[PDB]
UniProtKB/Swiss-Prot annotation:
Keyword entries, A-Z: Cytoplasmic vesicle, Extracellular matrix, Golgi apparatus, Lectin, Protein transport, Secreted, Signal, Transport
Keyword Signal: yes
Gene name for this UniProt entry: ZG16
Protein name: Zymogen granule membrane protein 16
Subcellular location: Secreted, Extracellular space, Extracellular matrix; Zymogen granule lumen; Golgi apparatus lumen
GO MF entries: carbohydrate binding; peptidoglycan binding
A Gene Ontology BP annotation from the UniProt entry: suppression of symbiont entry into host
Jacalin-type lectin domain segment(s): 3-138
Residues of the full protein shown: 22 to 159 of 167
Function per UniProt: May play a role in protein trafficking. May act as a linker molecule between the submembranous matrix on the luminal side of zymogen granule membrane (ZGM) and aggregated secretory proteins during granule formation in the TGN.
């Protein structure tokens, strides 16, 4: 077994979500993160050529980053309180894809097993992102 799970990072508010079904669409190719003054408000992830159903709320500005062909996320750091505040996706092309404000409890997620990358995310959401979990696999 090469799969592993990092999380949950955040608190117990909101309703659980998962992108487990989405990995069949392909590898992660892009990220959308809605952000305001204090929080990560929403999240969307592009699996192959297909975006996940948007999760989170509407009170923030949408930020979007596309990954390069064959670029994978190999480390995720961030910060949270009762809600998620910052995320940094570190790639195997040496890019640090940062979203949100530098404040709160820090976390640092890396994969357990050899040669695995970020395949999908899960977590909790409502009007904001309450929590996030990272799922690693081949
Ligand atoms: O005390 C935790 C309670 O949190 C409630 O979820 C919140 C939503 O109602 C609101 O719209 O968004 C925020 C931020 O995303 C959520 O935390 C849950 O509905 C309750 O079940 C829970 O008791
Ligand atoms: Cl950058
Ligand atoms: Cl940390």
């Amino acid at each position: 077994r090469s799969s592993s799970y990092s999380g949950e990072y955040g608190s117990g508010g909101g309703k659980r979500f998962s992108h487990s079904g989405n990995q069949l669409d392909g590898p992660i190719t892009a990220l959308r993160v809605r952000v305001n003054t204090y929080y990560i408000v929403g999240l969307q992830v592009r699996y192959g050529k297909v975006w996940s159903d948007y999760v989170g709320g509407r009170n923030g500005d949408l930020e979007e980053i596309f990954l390069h062909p064959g670029e994978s996320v190999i480390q995720v750091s961030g910060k949270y309180k009762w809600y998620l505040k910052k995320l940094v996706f570190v790639t195997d092309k040496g890019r640090y894809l940062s979203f949100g404000k530098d404040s709160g409890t820090s976390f640092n997620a890396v994969p357990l097993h050899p040669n695995t990358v970020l395949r999908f995310i899960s977590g909790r959401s409502g009007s904001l992102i309450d929590a996030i979990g990272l799922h690693w696999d081949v």
